[PDB]
Ligand SMILES: Nc1ncnc2c1ncn2[C@@H]1O[C@H](COP(=O)(O)OP(=O)(O)OP(=O)(O)O)[C@@H](O)[C@H]1O
Ligand SMILES: Nc1ncnc2c1ncn2[C@@H]1O[C@H](COP(=O)(O)OP(=O)(O)OP(=O)(O)O)[C@@H](O)[C@H]1O
């Protein structure tokens with residue numbers, strides 16, 4: 001790759017003597033390191049850096065007008081993934097973005113796994129109905145997969161999704177396009193996300209990744225006195241997930257647990273996301289499914305609320321929803 | 337060897353003396369010249385005279401102590417910094433002919449002290465001052481505010497500002513270029529007696545030196561030593577007041593405060609000033625700590641309280 | 648007398664020159680290149696390169712006039728502009744830090760929109776370059792901010808009822824403002840360095856650019872980088888290049904940082920990341936933080952103004968007051 005550059009043979013010979021391979025590891029080093037290794041003066045080092053940088057990044061120029069006008073060339077800025085419920089889609093103004101990590105947080109019985117299953121069902125709908133015509137990847141880190149709930153959801157799919165024409169759903173084979181994986185350790189999860197998910201995404205089998213819990217493996221090994229390795233692992237995992245999502249234009253959804261609050265935007269709230277600010281820096285859209293059980297429970301029905309914590313384009317708001325035999329349904333006319 | 341520098345050199349002898357070496361005049365002066373008269377063929381009487389005159393024009397001659405005493409009695413001076421606390425800390429101003437280093441944490445006091453001192457010297461003494469801004473930390477509004485705090489005449493402020501020159505150098509090479517240009521122009525303009533520069537301030541030397549350091553290289557340290565030598569010779573051989581600012585580092589094994597740029601740079605300056613912020617009560621504002629870490633005329637370790645919001 | 652070490656020549660040629668008895672640049676100018684080349688064993692091309700590199704090596708009133716003739720970039724926040732002296736100053740590197748959800752990206756978008764305000768209203772009337780390292784650039788938010796600025800400027804011009812204000816606002820349309828924002832995307836830090844290296848010539852051809860934004864600088868440097876010394880060297884070089892570019896091209900530079908937790912004894916404090924030496928790089932540093940349901944802007948480090956605290960808010964129109 002080095003010989004592709006337009007440069008005099010002297011610097012090419014010096015680079016070859018310096019044990020260099022490609023432009024990436026040329027840009028990896030700095031000025032004084034290159035001076036020490038290659039024994040070159042400043043002007044030619046600057047020229048080599050300039051040429052390698054020009055080759056790597058090309059010479060194209062992009063404006064925001066092109067991003068706005070040309071919808072088809074840039075689907076990431078316009079294409080969204082539906083949640084299967086019009087109320088939830090209205091709350092999210094279309095659904096999940098294709099680039100970046102989305103997080104669900106909440107206590108037990110909030111309804112996170114039901115939403116994950118519903119999204120895994122609706123991802124493979126046709127394009128005009130919000131789907132992506134692709135499979136899904138499901139990773140479990142805490143317990144077994146909800147098989148009966150999945151079977152009921154596939155059975156009820158004609159009842160839940162009524163806008164889609166009836167003659168179109170029978171051709172959709174649901175269970176055959178969902179992949180299930182299971183891990184039991186932080187190292188196992190790292191190896192899985194490193195060398196299994198890219199294989200699935202490369203062949204076009206799936207275009208959606210769901211992790212049923214990221215806090216579960218981490219809350220078992222690292223104590224309160226080992227924050228540095230925990231932060232290193234969290235940063236590596238977030239970087240890899242973001243790289244994969246950007247490369248393959250596939251949404252990533254993470255399910256998270258909560259802790260007890262005993263400066264970060266949480267004052268009038270008793271629970272906060274578990275991992276901390278290090279993991280919170282890696283995210284794009286943050287939601288919070290919450291169930292108010294201690295109060296307004298004597299009315300006979302649970303009170304479930306989904307709230308948008310932060311997003312670059314979504315105002316803080318919340319809506320209400322219920323879980324029934326066919327799936328998750330949002331209550332009309334309740335957006336904050 | 338070179339031609340035309342000294343009389344008596346012939347175009348034949350220069351190529352005749354190629355037998356020994358060609359590098360410098362050290363070959364001519366640091367050899368046993370007895371054998372040269374037969375190794376190549378030279379006159380004994382001319383060789384010694386040429387060596388003597390070459391050594392005369394290419395060396396330095398000692399000056400007696402009394403002459404130096406008398407000449408410093410009429411040449412050196414002292415320039416106040418504009419702060420009574422600093423003045424009483426370092427004997428009513430800094431002495432021209434030495435190197436003054438100001439070390440502090442991020443944003444503590446260094447740039448403000450440099451600007452106030454420059455404003456005082458430009459207004460309270462009517463002399464030219466050069467400023468070398470490297471980190472971009474110099475706004476003219478601050479200088480205007482200081483001058484307004486001093487006097488109220490607009491023309492006085494304009495004239496005081498006209499004696500302040502600012503140059504930008506974002507790497508070691510530009511700084512060396514501008515410093516050598518100043519050296520050359522002042523050495524050439526020794527005949528005149530107006531418009532000379534008596535104080536030059538380098539806003540930050542760590543900004544242009546830190547990228548070079550780090551790793552197993554040697555060129556960065558050599559460049560730093562060359563810059564230090566240039567600053568020292570500009571201060572001493574010309575009689576100028578040089579003030580530079582440096583960063584502060586926290587040691588790992590001992591956990592004590594330590595100046596940056598390492599042990600090699602630790603020997604460069606002669607007077608060291610350390611600025612720290614008073615934590616807890618009295619924090620923020622101008623209230624800060626000024627200490628003397630190195631001096632050739634005072635015992636070190638002393639403490640002093642200064643403010644940077646009362647001028 | 649200028650030493651050869653003070654010049655950017657090759658180590659090999661400097662070693663050969665000191666071997667041959669060369670220690671001053673002045674003596675080099677009086678020697679024919681052929682004789683010195685045959686004496687030191689140096690070919691013609693590198694000898695000519697040495698000869699040319701040797702060859703190649705503003706009072707405060709002008710600085711005041713330049714500072715006054717060019718304005719600041721308004722942030723639509725009156726108190727922030729007041730504590731900044733008028734807004735973001737040109738020729739100065741600015742850093743913003745804060746916990747997630749405070750509104751750094753909203754501020755970056757607002758600045759990118761505002762930099763194109765016509766000078767008749769106190770703007771700079773310049774373009775903007777946005778570099779994204781985390782993929783948080785959403786066009787819809789920029790459209791909303793641009794529309795809000797359109798409405799505010801139109802209302803102000805109508806109330807004032809001038810003549811040149813309408814002419815200035817005539818070309819200030821959504822398409823025109825949206826066409827003047829140049830977008831780049833960097834994933835690894837090598838890509839960021841490459842884009843930085845390409846920035847000078849691009850700004851040379853696009854001479855009307857008055858803003859450069861790098862949204863996210865901690866993320867490319869905080870992951871998969873074990874060697875701390877290499878990271879420090881890279882960050883120092885990047886800061887030097889950025890300040891040099893900002894001063895040379897008359898540009899305002901904004902960088903975005905992330906917070907981190909520092910633990911002493913049994914209490915934890917939120918401090919900016921990327922070590923301690925990074926604190927000297929930024930000319931101006933701001934910090935956003937939460938207090939109950941209120942957002943506060945604090946001027947941490949600045950060589951021109953005093954420390955202050957400002958209350959700001961994020962609304963559908965964008966970065967605003969209160
Ligand atoms: N027909 C149904 N089938 C299954 N669950 C139902 C049904 N009707 C209502 N539900 C409710 O669905 C909820 C399922 O909870 P879910 O598995 O989503 O919890 P979670 O938020 O993932 O919690 P955890 O941290 O334990 O995994 C239960 O609280 C249950 O009351
Ligand atoms: N009116 C004022 N104008 C300017 N600075 C002021 C004013 N009042 C107080 N200050 C203080 O001046 C300080 C300026 O710091 P300064 O740039 O001198 O320090 P530094 O250590 O040289 O910084 P750096 O490492 O960023 O180059 C600020 O910390 C601020 O608190």
Ligand SMILES: Nc1ncnc2c1ncn2[C@@H]1O[C@H](COP(=O)(O)OP(=O)(O)O)[C@@H](O)[C@H]1O
Nearest residue numbers: 312313314315316747748749750751752753963
């Ligand atoms: N359309 C909108 N209307 C109102 N508020 C919004 C809108 N879009 C985003 N916000 C608010 O602006 C904030 C953006 O924060 P952000 O810039 O993403 O912080 P960071 O970049 O540090 O993560 C969010 O907290 C969100 O509440």
Ligand SMILES: [Mg+2]
Nearest residue numbers: 112113114212
């Ligand atoms: Mg669950």
Ligand SMILES: [Mg+2]
Nearest residue numbers: 446447473950
């Ligand atoms: Mg400073």
Ligand SMILES: [Mg+2]
Nearest residue numbers: 751752781783
């Ligand atoms: Mg952001």
